[PDB]
């Protein structure tokens, strides 16, 4: 049976799958280097796989849509941690400290009346 | 510039232009409509353009065919 996990990050929803085979990365039918992740947030997809014994442990198939570059990357970040249910909640105890299972409640703020975008009150004239 | 194919004019003034050719020219014609462009047949004739007070005696000339009647009467009084 497959080892599934969801995760999401600022309206960006991923669908992670884990298996016992080879460590080729497949995302949206595309490679990890061909998933354009060169600058900061390059390895945030493998941030939950930072402090683990891997070498080349598992098959991984992931698929993210919605949001942008960093939002999709954090969806993969939080998605892989849910997919670690192959090792149940034993490895979570150490993963709690890292705060990758922690889902980000920070969402973009609504535009408000008499404000430029959510906060900035438009300047007034002198006194 | 604008108005696509064909220069737009009013019907009542077209009759006035053809009246000046057929019946013959006499005096400056007092017209309220500023929408109609000048044509080649209007060269030589006299008209008068209203603009919020009284009709200004404007004379038609060869190179005025490109421009409108209302261009030659400025509406806003200054000085």
């Amino acid at each position: 049976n497959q080892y599934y996990g969801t995760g999401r990050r600022k309206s960006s929803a991923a669908r992670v799958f884990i298996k016992p085979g080879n460590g080729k990365i497949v995302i949206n039918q595309r490679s990890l280097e061909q998933y354009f992740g060169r600058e900061t947030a390059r390895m945030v997809v493998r941030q939950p796989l930072e402090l683990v014994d891997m070498v080349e442990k598992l098959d991984l198939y992931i698929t993210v849509k919605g949001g942008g570059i960093s939002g999709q990357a954090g969806a993969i970040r939080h998605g892989i941690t849910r997919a670690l249910m192959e090792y149940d909640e034993s490895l979570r105890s150490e993963l709690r400290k890292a705060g990758f299972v922690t889902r980000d409640a920070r969402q973009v703020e609504r535009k408000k009346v008499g404000l430029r975008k959510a906060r900035r009150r438009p300047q007034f004239s002198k006194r | 510039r604008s108005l696509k194919k064909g220069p737009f004019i009013d019907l009542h003034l077209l009759k006035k232009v053809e009246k000046a050719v057929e019946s013959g020219d006499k005096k400056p014609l007092r017209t309220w409509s500023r929408r109609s462009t000048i044509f080649p047949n209007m060269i030589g004739l006299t008209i008068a353009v209203h603009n919020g007070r009284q009709h200004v005696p404007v004379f038609v000339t060869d190179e005025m065919v490109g421009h409108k009647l209302g261009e030659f009467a400025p509406t806003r009084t200054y000085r």
């Binding site: - | 190179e63 421009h67 209302g70 261009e71 030659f72 400025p74």
Partner: protein
């Protein structure tokens, strides 16, 4: 390198060199080099005298430099002599297209004074 009009640029691209002359800009600049069969990135250096006069003939077709200045100045002066809205608006030193003179006439009008 006289190049038809009195402007003589050098040590730059051919696309830049053209736009420096009066009555020619970025669109025509590409069209003259494309018509003559010249590259965009090649400079005025390493260009023979027999390659200059081919491009000289292309710019010689369209009216440029002092001939275009008088042509535009004819359409300014002639239009002023009509006594039209635009005609009175040129001579008095004010916006012709119908921009707002309430505030920000500063380009066509000129600097503030007492």
């Amino acid at each position: 390198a006289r190049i038809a009009g009195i402007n003589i640029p050098d040590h730059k691209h051919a696309v830049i060199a053209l736009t420096s002359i009066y009555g020619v800009g970025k669109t025509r600049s590409k069209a003259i080099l494309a018509a003559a069969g010249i590259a965009e990135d090649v400079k005025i250096s390493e260009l023979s005298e027999g390659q200059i006069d081919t491009l000289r003939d292309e710019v010689a077709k369209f009216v440029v430099e002092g001939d275009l200045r008088r042509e535009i100045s004819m359409s300014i002066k002639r239009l002023m002599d009509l006594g039209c809205y635009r005609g009175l608006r040129h001579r008095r030193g004010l916006p012709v297209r119908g921009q707002r003179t309430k505030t920000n006439a500063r380009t066509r009008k000129g600097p503030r004074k007492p």
